[PDB]
């Protein structure tokens, strides 16, 4: 991929991540990690961490939104959507946003706010 | 990950991988390609490729295999269990299987026939 400006549109989604990441430590569903999927500034799927609540590790926020998004668009490629963050995904959640053909991706970074990367 | 040997007892294991790569592509559930995750010297689940059957790009043989594996045992890890995978995992299951703490990993090769890696 290559990086990307961050953009006033990205706040609202990004800060939307954030309150899933809230919601999801909140009531014990997982770590507190937030993932917002859009297409054409409308959410198609806003989840957070599911570990625990669904007994299994692959069950991050960025899987759990990418798994929600193609089963509501029914498909299995989501290149006109992008994808929030609440922070960097792992090594896992970036090789199913790469396998899954996601646009764009914004995730909430220390050094910098946020960071946009497109694909 | 260190490499390790390839021992007679895992052939029978890998065997059952490949028989779920041959199963998966026969109904149409996804690519062939399969995981076989064993606990104890016992099979605690037996997967395939699911993409199409599930309509999910995460859906590889790996991390099915590591969802019914930790649903059957009731465990976010699986520090006691091995995986055997038909072939090399991508970049997703290599995370997945590093993020359940699978202890070891035997995957089918070309030049090697079988590979063998301790984590
Ligand atoms: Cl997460
Ligand atoms: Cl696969
Ligand atoms: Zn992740
Ligand atoms: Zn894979």
């Given at each position: 991929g290559h990086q990307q400006a961050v953009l006033d549109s990205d706040h609202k989604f990004l800060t939307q991540a954030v309150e899933e990441?809230?919601?999801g430590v909140d009531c014990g569903d997982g770590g507190p990690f937030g993932?917002?999927?859009v297409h054409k500034n409308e959410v198609v799927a806003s989840c957070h961490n599911m570990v625990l609540k669904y007994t299994d590790?692959?069950?991050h926020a960025e899987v759990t939104a990418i798994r929600e998004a193609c089963k509501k668009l029914n498909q299995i490629?989501?290149?006109e959507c992008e994808i929030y963050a609440s922070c960097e995904p792992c090594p896992m959640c970036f090789g199913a946003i790469h396998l899954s053909r996601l646009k764009r991706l914004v995730y909430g970074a220390k050094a910098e706010a946020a960071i946009a990367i497109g694909f």
């Open positions: 990441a809230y919601k993932a917002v999927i590790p692959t069950a490629e989501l290149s």
